[PDB]
Amino acid sequence: ASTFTNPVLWEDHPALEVFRVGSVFYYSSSTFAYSPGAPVLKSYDLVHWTPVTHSVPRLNFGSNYDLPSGTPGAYVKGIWASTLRYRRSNDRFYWYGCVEGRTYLWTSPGGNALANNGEVPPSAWNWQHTATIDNCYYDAGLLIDDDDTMYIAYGNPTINVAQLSPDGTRQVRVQQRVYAHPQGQTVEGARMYKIRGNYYILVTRPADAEYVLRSTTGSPFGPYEARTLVSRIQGPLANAGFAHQGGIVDAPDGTWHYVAFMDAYPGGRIPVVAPLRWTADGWPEVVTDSQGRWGTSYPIPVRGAKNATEGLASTDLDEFRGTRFSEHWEWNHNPDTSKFTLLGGNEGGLILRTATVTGDLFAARNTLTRRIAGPKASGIFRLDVRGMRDGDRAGAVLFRDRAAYIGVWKQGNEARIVMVDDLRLNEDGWRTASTGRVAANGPVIDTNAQQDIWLRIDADITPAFGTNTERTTTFYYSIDGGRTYTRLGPAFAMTNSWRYFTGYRFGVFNFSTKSLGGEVKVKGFKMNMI
Numbered sequence: 001a002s003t004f005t006n007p008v009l010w011e012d013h014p015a016l017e018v019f020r021v022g023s024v025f026y027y028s029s030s031t032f033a034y035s036p037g038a039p040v041l042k043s044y045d046l047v048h049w050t051p052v053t054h055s056v057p058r059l060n061f062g063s064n065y066d067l068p069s070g071t072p073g074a075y076v077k078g079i080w081a082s083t084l085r086y087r088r089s090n091d092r093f094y095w096y097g098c099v100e101g102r103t104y105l106w107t108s109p110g111g112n113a114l115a116n117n118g119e120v121p122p123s124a125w126n127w128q129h130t131a132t133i134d135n136c137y138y139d140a141g142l143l144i145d146d147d148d149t150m151y152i153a154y155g156n157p158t159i160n161v162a163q164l165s166p167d168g169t170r171q172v173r174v175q176q177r178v179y180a181h182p183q184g185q186t187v188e189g190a191r192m193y194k195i196r197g198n199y200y201i202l203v204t205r206p207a208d209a210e211y212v213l214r215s216t217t218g219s220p221f222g223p224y225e226a227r228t229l230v231s232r233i234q235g236p237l238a239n240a241g242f243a244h245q246g247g248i249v250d251a252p253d254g255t256w257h258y259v260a261f262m263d264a265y266p267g268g269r270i271p272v273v274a275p276l277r278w279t280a281d282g283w284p285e286v287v288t289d290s291q292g293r294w295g296t297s298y299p300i301p302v303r304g305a306k307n308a309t310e311g312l313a314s315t316d317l318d319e320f321r322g323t324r325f326s327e328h329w330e331w332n333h334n335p336d337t338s339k340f341t342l343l344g345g346n347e348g349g350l351i352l353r354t355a356t357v358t359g360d361l362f363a364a365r366n367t368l369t370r371r372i373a374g375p376k377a378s379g380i381f382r383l384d385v386r387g388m389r390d391g392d393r394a395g396a397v398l399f400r401d402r403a404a405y406i407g408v409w410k411q412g413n414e415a416r417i418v419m420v421d422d423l424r425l426n427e428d429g430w431r432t433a434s435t436g437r438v439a440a441n442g443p444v445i446d447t448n449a450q451q452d453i454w455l456r457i458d459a460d461i462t463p464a465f466g467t468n469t470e471r472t473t474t475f476y477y478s479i480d481g482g483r484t485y486t487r488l489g490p491a492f493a494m495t496n497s498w499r500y501f502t503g504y505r506f507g508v509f510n511f512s513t514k515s516l517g518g519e520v521k522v523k524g525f526k527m528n529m530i
């Protein structure tokens, strides 16, 4: 396939950093209070991406990341725009991110990637907390320079550059205000580069432009001068704001590409790719289509690229086998590890024991989530719910700050299917605004039905950002082994607001309104494109 179409991945992976090691491209994204945090995706062509690891296996940023006492928890805090690079000299990946005023470094060995055309064996990833720096590198962009000195560009509304110690664990020096926009416009989203002898920093003007800065002195400390890379460019997707932020990366053939993202709410922020050309005077420019738009299709960045993949694809059936989750799953806040187990053996399965007593889904620990692929997808959870106890509520949630679910309520000796809507957080502070209402009752389910209940969410995430239209999701259940599905409840209208940042997700939850002791088994999950 000699060309590709935008977007390259229709899944919420915001604040991307991209770089190349040998034959492999790596992409790092932001995850807020979702745990594990800071996913890493891998590609051979900048187009087909597979998740391979997460840089922060459990969030270590403070006790609120364990959701100890309900809303506002650490909702919409945690990992904002951060940065990742691979250091050849010690075969180590470095992830830095500022969270609530301190900067955290997590590192992993690379399994000798520099020597194996950039491949990291799946077993070699092993991320550990390596340092904390007592300066906030808001919207950090790491550069490992050609002489092995490490720098971080950061800031909002103006850009600073810090020099780190040789081991990357301490700040040695900061130059403040290496760039300020001359008309007082806010910039942020720094990514930092050393390209053919010169220093570049990419910054965004939220949320519609990207500037390229270049050091006027040839020093990493600048000062820097700017040119526009994109400003309010049209395409390649409608109703998804503007392509901005992101970063630039070289393919093995020496050609450069700009990987930006779109505000494709209600789905989230998704990556788009364009080629770059370099001017004779040493600046990069986006290659547009014949109409000056970010093109819907372009030549493939790598020809005859490897197609091999690690682990389960986004749409692959996941029966929760083995000892670890696939790279697609993330908990809402850190999980209580004493309250879930992956069963292993022939069948696998995930046991979710109730971990929180609450009437409020947003206060519940151990809600397991994953990204919805767009523009439309069905997510199906298969459960055994015989272990539910009085007051337990479990099910499949369309999860965000305006949420709905289809699930099972156990009251006394009755288990029944319900559809619940009007679950809402207040965008001003993220306290609960509504704990929901039963919008429809489904049937009472007997023990045989309880042993195999299938819960289905059909979500439409077709972009609607900036429009007056809200997309809708519908909910279904099966109590005949997935052979027949029955619709339950109204169509649920989804928010287009950007304030929660993360897109809508599919999730499975289990909590109690009375007491702990109950459990469900999640036998499987499947996402189908619809």
Ligand SMILES: OC[C@@H]1O[C@@H](O[C@H]2[C@H](O[C@@H]3CO[C@@H](O)[C@H](O)[C@H]3O)OC[C@@H](O[C@@H]3OC[C@@H](O)[C@H](O)[C@H]3O)[C@@H]2O)[C@H](O)[C@H]1O
Pocket (backbone or CB within 6 Å): 156, 204, 206, 207, 208, 241, 244, 245, 263, 269, 498
């Ligand atoms: O378009 C959705 C996302 O917005 C960008 O993120 C920043 C955001 O930008 C506003 C988006 O809507 C515009 O109409 C408006 O004019 C933009 O300002 O809001 C600002 C910012 O968060 C702030 O960052 C600095 C920090 O110190 C503040 O506490 C924090 O509120 C946010 O990053 C993003 O580009 C796009 O995806």
